[PDB]
Structure formats: structure tokens, C-alpha cells
Design a protein around this ligand. Structure first.
Ligand code: MG
Lengths: 16, 373, 726
């Protein structure tokens, strides 16, 4: 459940 | 003053980072001058595979190597970063939305505190609370073997032998031919400012970019075109495999914090001759490390959780005032005895005057611009 | 089989692969159209360049069937041939149609000689046949394939219509984008293709792993494919080895119904040259790009369309090995390569030519000896006009041939030989310096030409190391000036009525330029079609003055026909750049025809500059077929965008290097082939052997660096390799 998790990027709030 | 201690073996829950976005860039000249929104020191990658068989010597030019960085008056200055931030401010007219503003290397050292001993990862930082934001600056070694100097020089030599000052389509042949005798210089760098975050914390990090791999989009975010050049000893057995895995983990952390998608390694031999070059994508490094060494592979997720916990602790234990005219506070962070120690700098300390009412942490122009808002 | 292709097959066999032509499927007795968007059996392609002279010429006078009676039948055959070529190639991004324009004066001299011969020697046979018929139908003139003729305008209109029809009809053409550079754009077809490729490389956004294909029957294309330094390159051409076996059963004439084709793979040729051009112990670093450039220069020196070949270098596809052997021993004694991005190193060239002149008399003697042996084998098996041989008096196999050569072929006194000797040699060196630039950087000079009918001897090439070679580019001739300078009086019907009075009337001021009879020098050639025709050289000033005198009498149509043009770009309404181009070019402000848009490679696989079309294209318009036959439907411009196209000027000199990010294809040659090419190891049946040859096309992998001992991934790859071997 947690060992197979890869560090990834997430969408973040941005301006333009 | 506030005093806090944190155990580097604690783990948080954050697993992902906000997508890094370039907000600016600047170029630092050989005489400690900051050119904002200027790419005079941005290099372009060019190293054909056929050149790896030319037996390039990475020790050449060591005697005429010009280390301008060691002669800098403020080697770890935040002045250029703050000027880039301020140019972005003036473009938008509003205070930028971030909680911690520092350098990429400072964050990388803070994260690696959880995997390296203090004798290896020396951390000594000054954190200043201004306008509701944390500005972190590392105080230099201030100290002022031949093999160690050569090893440090070989990275700059590899970056000189594998990059061009101008795009390949704009470079005459004679420049490429005389590249092997070019003088290696340290100190003139190109730095990109990147807005990212972990968990609930939003950071701004300045990263020294080595080269552009494919091409540069003028006026656009160029993170996907940047690459990170590193030089290392050639691997010959499984022990060197593990050593390289730890080094690759460190480089992956460095590139992941800011979103550099390409990593290039020059493997050299005992005679400082470039044996080979290998290319990695920072997205596949965690999976490769897991498939080759699970102990280092899980360290990626452990590092992201530790990074989130560290940022949350720093935001919680440091009081921030959103008023630019409020009292500025200065703190000192040190990694020792398996703990991160944070302690406010008192007025009796000799460093209080420099950090609070001087241009050691924050330049005068940046703080007066922030006040004028 | 031509000697060039026999040499290529014997020396580099694994560059030749067969084209897989996918026949249309059949069901319910209805022919299913070929799916263009389907996967290509040969391999995916991005850019296709057509040298249209290699399509119109087979269509005009095919050897399979009698030639078409009318011009419309020729255009229908052109449509069919182009459609077949594109169905077997299937570009995914770019199509370039290059029709020969006004060539430079160096090419115009050879064109003038060719048309003069193909007129006079053809009309003598026509007169013989007519007399034979009378004692007891008119052939179409091949000189109509020349810029300035009405047939070229008809072909340009037909090509534009066919392209619009394919883009607006075929769903597999939505992402294609077609550039038509007809005869109104100066330059040859291959010169245009080379310039296009050079401009494409100069883009920073250019994909280094673009796959290119060129169509054409010219044997220079191979070398030109090497001159691009884009290793993902191949040549599509007609299978000559099948033509060899065609002479003899239903399948044999089925191959007549559809002629098989061939891929000549350039990456495999580079693999061959990597072992072929290796010289050990150089005082400088050995670069394969520079060695390939030297090989290409030597190949063009051994033979080209702009200078007569040296007496010792009788034929190309041979004596290329002679020059390679000389180069392999000259190079260790020099400081650098003989060429640098289209520039000659004159000291190195002089060293090469001195070594060539040292062994010239020996090769003359051996050529005579083998000619005598061949004559013995054949025996065992068994002047104002006319044809005259200057070589028989020269006696090149006998001592003292220098003076005899010069006196016989130039009619000068011996005391005046040296002044001639130093002139011709210089004009020859400025020749090769021209030719190389013409194929590496663009046309050095539109007006330069070699003012002699003969080449100097090999021994005469000395004393030019100090030569300072410069060219004035000038401007190309107009189509009418090019016509007046390549056509005889017998082919003057192509020109307007005004100009044809300067070809035949005895009172015309340039009547001396158009003799109905001229001498022919065989120059030692046995066959008659390759003899040297001693035509007088056109005086540019006199010809230009005379023709511009006749311009004011031309009508509006001819004067419009005498205007230089620019290429055009045609795209479908589903293209990536359709909205941007239409918005920026066909808006209210852009309607002034003043704005251009410069676009780069990443978005749609093509870079350049496009502007509002000059052929009257408009949105919400109609396209009508210009052929009165075939029931070809009218079109709508709502499914098409047409623009005026031009190349982005090169920011700097093009470098003969491999670009950053280039991932090579899967290597084809094993160690045995490389060893045989390196160490000169030597071991009808080739036609079947070519079919089993298959060459992977496109990048193989993600990384541009091959595994090499001392790396992490290399360590694991070699560990797995050793595990698999054991
Ligand atoms: Mg680096």
C-alpha cells in the first residue's frame, strides 16, 4: 500500500 | 527567544510535491554582480557520443583554473534571488504567494539531514522572518590533498567539455574545436528561481542550472529543457554500484526539488580521463533505485515525507507577521546530535545587528520594496 | 544494370533493401482503397522529397508502353506515378515537390550541349525514317521539360490541384503539409532539396532523429544523402536489378505492370564508411563527418555536371577507389582534412593532385594494356562538323603526351602551353571550390562557368595553393534567358515568336551562338552518345542585351510567364498550424499581403516563413481541375490552406556535424562486414539476395550514448549480456 508509492508531482494552484 | 529540537528519524505523511514553475532567472558574473532576467551564463549541451572515445582528460587546465567563487565577498548571498523575486513582484504588483524563500541546496541539505551524519552534511543556517515569510541562508564554511582539489575541479572540467556558451546552431566550428583548451572558471553561474511546495508549505528555491539539453523557449518556462551535469568515478563492481546509487539518490533529490528532468553523468577513471557518459531521467530514478537497491529506493518516499515534516515544523515553530513594518526575527538552525536545533538569535548576539538591521540575510532594496507594498 | 549501381551493390550490398508495396485489399468484388494512415511495412517516414524530374521523364517517354499521345495523358500518368510513390513511401509530416528551375551557368552549358545533341542526332534519325517511309506522326520533343515552356505551367497547376485533392480527400493527409517548388523557383531539384534540409537543421527545435527520404534517379543522390549529415536518410528509386532480369513468365510482366522499387539506406552506408575511411595514426583527431566530407568531395571531383573529367579519371564509381588510396596516404602527412564545411584546403588538395599526377602515366599505360586485352578477347569471341578524335594523335599511353594533348585539343603553340596550363588549372580549381559550395552551402555564383571544353592533365595541377578563391553570387537568369541559352534553333518553338528570329535568321546579332552543325570530339570514347560537342560558349553580355531588346515586344501573358516565383505550402484544415496560419494570414489586417509568420519545428514538424498566397487563393473558394479528362472533381478551399512559403535564412555557416540528441538506428553490419571493408577482405544472384535484406528504420532506444565499460547502466547491461551468453 505504501511501499509501492513513487514520489510524484501534483497540480498546484497557479496564476496565469 | 524560541528554541526547538526535531528528531530526524521522524516521518511525516506528504508524498507529492507541487509542480515546480519557473518564476524567473538571473546570471551571476565573475565579479559578484547579478544580472536579473539575463541568460549570459546559460550553457547549451553538446557532447556527441563519438567524443567519448577521444580520451578526454579532465585534469587538463587545472593550474589555470580560475575560482572566482572562493574570492566572493558574499558566497551565499540571497541578493540576486531577492532581486529576481522583486522583479516578479513588480511585474504582478502583488506579494508572491510563498512561505519559505531559500536556495535549492539549502533545502537539499535539510532533507539529507535525515540520511547523512552531521560530519558529512554540515548544516548551519540563518532563518529570518520578514513580511510573513521565512528566508533561509547558509553561512559559508569561512575557513578560507591534491586529489580532493582535482576531484572538485573535474566536475567543472566536464561541464566545460560538454557544454557550449551559445546554441550549437549559433556556434562556429573553431569554438567547438578549441573547447578542449578553454579555461575552466567557477563563480559565473546561471540560476533559475522555481516556485514549488510540499504538503501545505509553498517554497521558492533558486537552483544553479548547468545546461539546456534541446532548446530554449524564449519567454516560457524552460524547466523541461534543463539538464543536470555531474561527474563521478567509473563503476567496476558491486561496491561502486552501491556508492553510485547513493550519489544518484542525492542528485535525484537535487533535481526533483526543482523539476530538472534530465541527469547526465560523466564516469571517469583513476587518471581523470572521461570513460563514458550516461543519461537518466529524474522520474525513473526512484524505480531504478528500488529495482537495484531497495534500501536506497524507499529513501525517496522517506525523503519526501521527511521534507514535508521538516517544512511543517519550521512553519509551526517560527512565528510569522504579515506586516512588513513588524519586528524582524532571526533564528539559527544547526543539524547536530541527530537533531535539528532551532534557536532564536538574541540581541546580545553579535550576529543580531547584521541579520536584523543589515544586508546579511536581506538586501536593503528588497526589504524597502516589500515595505512599500 | 548501370556500372554505378553494380559497383554500389558489390561494394556496399547491405544498404539496398526492397520496397514492400502493399496491394489494396479485395472484398465482395470491390477494390478497397489503400489506407494511407495504416502502418507502413517499410518503416515510418517523416519527410519525403521528390525530384519531380525523376517522375515526369518516365511518364513522358516510358519504356513499358508507348508514350502518351497528348499532354493531359502525361499529366494523368504523372498523377498515377506520384500517387504510387507516396503510397509506398507514406510521409507523415512533410512532402516537398522540387521541379527544376533556372540552373546556374555552369549547369546551363551542359544543358545547352545536351539539347543540341538530342536535337541534331534525333532529327538526323527522324529524317532517315521519313525518307525510308516516303521512298516506299511527330515525336514529342523532350526539350519541353525546361523552365519557361507552357507545359511547365500546366504541370505546376496539375501538381497544385493534385496536392489539394489529396489533402482535402485522404484522411491520412490531415497532418501532412506539402511544399511545391515548381520551375518558376530558380535552382535544380536536388539543390532545392539540399537547401530545404539545411534550413531545417538550423532550427534549435529541429528533431535530430527526423527520418528523411528522397526520390530521384540521379546517382549523385547517395552522396547528397551523405552531404546532409542526417543519418536517418534513405533514397527511394527504381529497382534496376529487376530490370536486368526482366530481359528474357507472367510474374515477369506483372513486374512490368507494377515496377518494383528500392531503398538505399544511408545509415548503413555510414556504417560501411566508418570502416572504409579509417586512417590510423593521424596527427589530428579522426572525425567520421570530416572523412565522409572528404569522400564526398573526392566523388564529386571524379565526376560532376559542371566540369569535364580529368583524362586519367575516365569514369566515376571507379577511380574513387584511386583517390581514396591516394587520400589514405596523403592525409597522415597533412595538418587537417581537405574540406571544411564546403571549403577546400588548397595545400591538401594540391598534395592530393600531385600524388595523382605522379601515377597518371602508369594508369594511362595500364588502361591501354587492358584495352588491348579487351580487344583481343572480343576478337577471340568473334573540322567544322562530323566526329573527330583528338585522342588518337595524343597517344596518352606513349611518352610525351602532355604537349600532344595540349596542341591537339587546344590548337596552341608549345611556347604558349604554360600560360594556357596555368589558366585552365586555375579555372578548374575554382570549379571544384564552386561545386563543393554548391552542394554544401548554396550557389556560390550563378554566373561562373568553366570556359574550356577540356580538363588539364593530372600532372598540371600544381602552383594553386596560394589561390584566393572568391565568387560573386549574382542573380539567376529569367526563364527566357535560360531558354535562349540552352536550346538550338530546332527547338525554338518553345520560345515565343519574337525570340525565335534570333536563332535562325542570318542577320540576328547572336546568330553565331546557334549553329545547325557543330564538331564532335569523341575524346577516346567508343560510343557516340557521350562524345564532346564543341559548341561555342555563350557571351553573357551579348545574349542578355539581345534578349532584353526583345522583351518590350512580349505580350502580357509571356511577360507574366517570365517572372520568378517562390514555393507554396499546402495544408489541410485539420493541421496543427491551420488556425494560427489562417488567423494571421487571412484576417482583416493581414489582407494587405504584408505580414509573414515564421514558425519552428516542434509544433508540426516543419519550420519556415509563410505569407499570404500569391496565386489568388482565398477562403470559401473553389479549386477546379486543369486537366480536361479523368472526371476529376472540383474542390473547396474550406478544406485547404495555401500560402507562399520560404526558408528561414541560415543564421551561420552550416556545420557538418551530428546534432545533439541523435539516437542511432539498430546497426545492420556485423563484425564480419566491417572487417571485410576495413582489411579489404574479398569473398545475377544479388536480385534474390536483396529481398532477404531488411534494415530497421528510426531511433533505437531513448539515449544517444551507447553502453561502454565503466558506467552504471553499462555495468548492469554487460552483466546481463555475460549472463545471457553463458
Ligand atoms: Mg552540476
Amino acid at each position: 500500500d505504501e511501499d509501492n508509492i513513487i514520489p510524484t508531482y501534483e497540480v498546484g494552484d497557479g496564476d496565469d | 527567544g524560541v528554541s526547538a529540537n526535531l528528531f530526524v528519524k521522524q516521518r511525516g505523511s506528504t508524498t507529492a510535491l507541487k509542480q515546480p514553475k519557473e518564476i524567473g532567472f538571473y546570471s551571476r558574473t565573475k565579479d559578484e554582480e547579478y544580472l536579473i532576467s539575463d541568460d549570459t551564463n546559460l550553457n547549451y549541451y553538446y557532447l556527441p557520443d563519438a567524443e567519448l572515445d577521444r580520451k578526454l582528460d579532465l585534469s587538463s587546465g587545472f593550474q589555470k583554473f580560475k575560482d572566482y567563487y572562493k574570492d566572493f565577498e558574499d558566497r551565499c548571498s540571497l541578493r540576486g534571488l531577492l532581486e529576481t523575486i522583486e522583479s516578479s513582484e513588480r511585474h504582478k504588483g502583488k506579494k508572491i504567494n510563498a512561505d519559505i524563500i531559500t536556495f535549492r541546496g539549502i533545502a537539499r541539505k535539510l532533507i539529507s539531514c535525515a540520511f547523512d551524519s552531521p560530519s558529512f552534511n554540515t548544516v548551519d543556517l540563518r532563518i529570518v522572518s520578514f513580511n510573513g515569510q521565512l528566508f533561509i541562508k547558509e553561512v559559508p564554511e569561512a575557513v578560507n590533498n591534491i586529489n580532493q582539489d582535482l576531484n572538485v575541479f573535474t566536475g567543472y572540467k566536464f561541464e566545460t567539455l560538454a557544454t557550449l556558451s551559445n546554441p550549437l546552431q549559433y556556434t562556429p566550428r573553431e569554438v567547438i574545436e578549441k573547447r578542449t583548451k578553454r579555461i575552466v572558471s567557477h563563480g559565473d553561474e546561471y540560476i533559475s528561481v522555481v516556485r514549488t511546495g510540499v504538503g501545505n508549505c509553498k517554497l521558492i528555491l533558486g537552483a544553479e542550472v548547468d545546461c539546456i539539453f534541446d532548446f530554449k523557449e524564449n519567454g516560457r518556462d524552460n524547466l523541461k529543457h534543463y539538464a543536470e551535469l555531474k561527474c563521478t568515478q567509473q563503476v567496476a563492481n558491486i561496491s561502486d554500484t552501491h556508492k553510485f546509487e547513493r550519489k544518484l539518490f542525492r542528485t535525484w533529490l537535487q533535481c526533483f526539488l526543482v523539476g530538472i528532468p534530465r541527469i547526465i553523468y560523466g564516469f571517469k577513471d583513476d587518471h581523470y580521463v572521461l570513460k563514458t557518459v550516461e543519461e537518466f531521467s529524474t522520474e525513473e530514478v526512484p524505480v531504478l533505485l528500488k529495482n537495484n537497491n531497495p534500501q536506497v529506493g524507499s529513501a525517496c518516499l522517506e525523503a519526501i515525507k521527511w521534507y514535508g515534516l521538516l517544512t511543517e515544523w519550521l512553519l509551526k515553530m517560527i512565528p510569522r507577521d504579515e506586516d512588513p513594518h513588524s519586528q524582524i526575527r532571526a533564528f539559527k538552525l544547526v543539524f547536530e546530535n541527530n537533531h535539528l536545533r532551532l534557536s532564536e538569535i538574541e540581541e546580545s548576539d553579535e550576529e543580531y545587528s547584521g541579520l536584523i538591521d543589515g544586508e546579511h540575510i536581506l538586501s536593503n532594496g528588497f526589504k524597502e520594496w516589500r515595505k512599500s507594498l | 544494370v548501370p556500372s554505378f549501381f553494380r559497383w554500389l551493390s558489390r561494394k556496399y550490398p547491405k544498404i539496398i533493401s526492397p520496397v514492400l508495396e502493399e496491394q489494396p485489399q479485395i472484398v465482395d468484388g470491390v477494390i478497397l482503397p489503400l489506407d494511407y494512415s495504416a502502418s507502413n511495412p517499410n518503416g515510418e517516414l517523416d519527410n519525403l522529397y521528390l525530384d519531380m524530374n525523376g517522375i515526369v521523364h518516365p511518364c513522358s517517354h516510358p519504356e513499358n508502353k508507348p508514350p502518351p499521345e497528348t499532354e493531359d495523358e502525361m499529366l494523368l500518368a504523372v498523377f498515377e506515378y506520384t500517387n504510387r510513390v507516396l503510397n509506398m513511401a507514406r510521409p507523415r509530416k512533410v512532402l516537398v515537390m522540387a521541379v527544376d528551375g533556372v540552373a546556374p551557368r555552369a549547369k546551363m552549358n551542359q544543358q545547352r550541349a545536351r539539347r543540341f545533341r538530342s536535337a541534331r542526332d534525333a532529327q538526323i534519325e527522324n529524317e532517315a525514317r521519313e525518307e525510308i517511309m516516303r521512298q516506299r506522326k511527330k515525336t514529342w520533343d523532350s526539350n519541353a521539360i525546361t523552365p519557361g515552356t507552357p507545359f511547365m505551367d500546366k504541370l505546376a497547376a496539375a501538381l497544385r490541384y493534385w496536392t489539394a485533392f489529396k489533402l482535402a480527400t485522404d484522411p491520412g493527409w490531415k497532418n501532412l503539409q506539402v511544399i511545391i517548388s515548381d520551375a518558376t523557383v530558380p535552382g535544380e531539384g536536388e539543390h532545392k532539396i539540399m537547401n530545404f534540409i539545411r534550413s531545417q537543421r538550423a532550427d534549435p527545435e529541429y528533431n535530430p532523429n527526423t527520418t528523411h527520404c528522397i526520390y530521384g534517379l540521379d546517382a549523385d543522390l547517395i552522396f547528397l544523402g551523405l552531404a546532409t549529415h542526417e543519418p536517418h536518410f534513405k533514397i527511394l528509386r527504381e529497382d534496376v536489378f529487376a530490370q536486368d532480369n526482366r530481359k528474357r513468365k507472367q510474374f515477369l510482366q506483372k513486374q512490368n505492370s507494377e515496377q518494383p522499387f528500392l531503398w538505399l539506406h544511408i545509415n548503413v552506408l555510414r556504417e560501411y564508411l566508418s570502416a572504409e575511411l579509417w586512417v590510423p595514426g593521424l596527427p589530428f583527431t579522426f572525425d567520421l563527418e570530416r572523412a565522409i566530407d572528404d569522400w564526398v568531395f573526392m566523388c564529386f571531383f571524379c565526376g560532376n555536371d559542371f566540369l569535364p573529367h580529368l583524362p586519367c579519371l575516365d569514369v566515376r564509381e571507379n577511380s574513387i577507389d584511386i583517390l581514396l588510396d591516394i587520400w589514405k596516404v596523403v592525409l597522415p602527412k597533412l595538418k587537417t582534412y581537405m574540406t571544411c564545411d564546403g571549403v577546400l584546403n588548397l595545400p591538401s588538395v594540391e598534395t592530393l593532385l600531385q600524388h595523382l599526377g605522379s601515377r597518371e602515366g602508369d594508369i594511362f599505360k595500364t588502361r591501354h594494356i587492358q584495352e588491348a586485352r579487351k580487344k583481343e578477347a572480343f576478337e577471340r569471341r568473334k573540322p567544322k562538323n562530323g566526329v573527330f578524335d583528338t585522342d588518337e594523335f595524343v597517344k596518352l599511353f606513349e611518352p610525351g603526351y602532355h604537349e600532344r594533348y595540349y596542341t591537339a585539343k587546344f590548337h596552341v603553340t608549345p611556347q604558349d602551353i604554360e600560360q594556357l596550363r596555368k589558366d585552365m588549372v586555375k579555372c578548374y580549381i575554382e570549379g571544384v571550390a564552386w561545386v563543393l559550395m554548391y552542394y554544401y552551402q548554396g550557389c556560390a555564383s550563378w554566373n561562373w562557368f568553366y570556359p574550356y571544353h577540356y580538363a588539364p592533365l593530372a600532372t598540371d595541377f600544381h602552383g594553386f595553393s596560394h589561390l584566393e578563391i572568391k565568387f560573386e553570387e549574382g542573380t539567376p537568369f529569367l526563364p527566357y534567358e535560360q531558354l535562349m541559352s540552352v536550346l538550338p534553333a530546332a527547338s525554338g518553338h518553345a520560345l515565343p515568336k519574337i525570340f525565335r528570329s534570333l536563332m535562325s535568321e542570318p542577320d540576328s546579332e547572336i546568330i553565331d551562338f546557334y549553329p545547325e552543325e557543330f564538331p564532335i570530339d569523341m575524346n577516346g570514347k567508343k560510343m557516340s552518345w557521350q562524345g564532346i560537342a564543341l559548341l561555342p560558349f555563350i557571351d553573357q553580355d551579348r545574349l542578355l542585351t539581345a534578349v532584353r531588346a526583345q522583351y518590350p515586344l512580349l505580350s502580357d501573358a509571356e511577360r507574366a510567364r517570365n517572372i520568378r516565383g517562390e514555393p507554396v505550402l499546402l495544408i489541410s484544415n485539420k493541421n496543427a498550424n491551420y488556425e494560427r496560419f489562417s488567423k494571421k494570414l487571412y484576417s482583416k489586417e493581414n489582407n494587405n499581403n504584408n505580414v509573414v509568420v515564421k514558425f519552428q519545428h516542434f509544433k508540426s514538424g516543419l519550420s519556415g516563413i509563410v505569407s499570404k498566397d500569391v496565386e489568388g487563393f482565398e477562403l470559401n473558394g473553389k479549386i477546379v481541375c486543369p486537366i480536361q479528362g479523368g472526371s476529376l472533381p472540383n474542390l473547396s478551399t474550406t478544406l485547404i490552406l495555401k500560402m507562399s512559403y520560404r526558408l528561414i535564412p541560415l543564421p551561420s555557416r552550416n556545420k557538418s556535424i551530428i546534432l545533439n540528441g541523435f539516437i542511432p538506428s539498430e546497426p545492420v553490419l556485423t563484425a564480419y562486414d566491417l572487417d571485410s571493408i576495413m582489411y579489404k577482405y574479398n569473398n545475377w544472384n544479388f536480385g534474390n539476395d536483396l529481398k532477404q535484406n531488411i534494415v530497421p528504420v528510426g531511433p533505437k532506444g531513448i539515449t544517444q550514448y551507447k553502453p561502454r565499460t565503466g558506467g552504471y547502466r553499462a555495468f548492469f547491461y554487460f552483466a546481463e549480456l555475460s549472463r545471457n551468453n553463458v
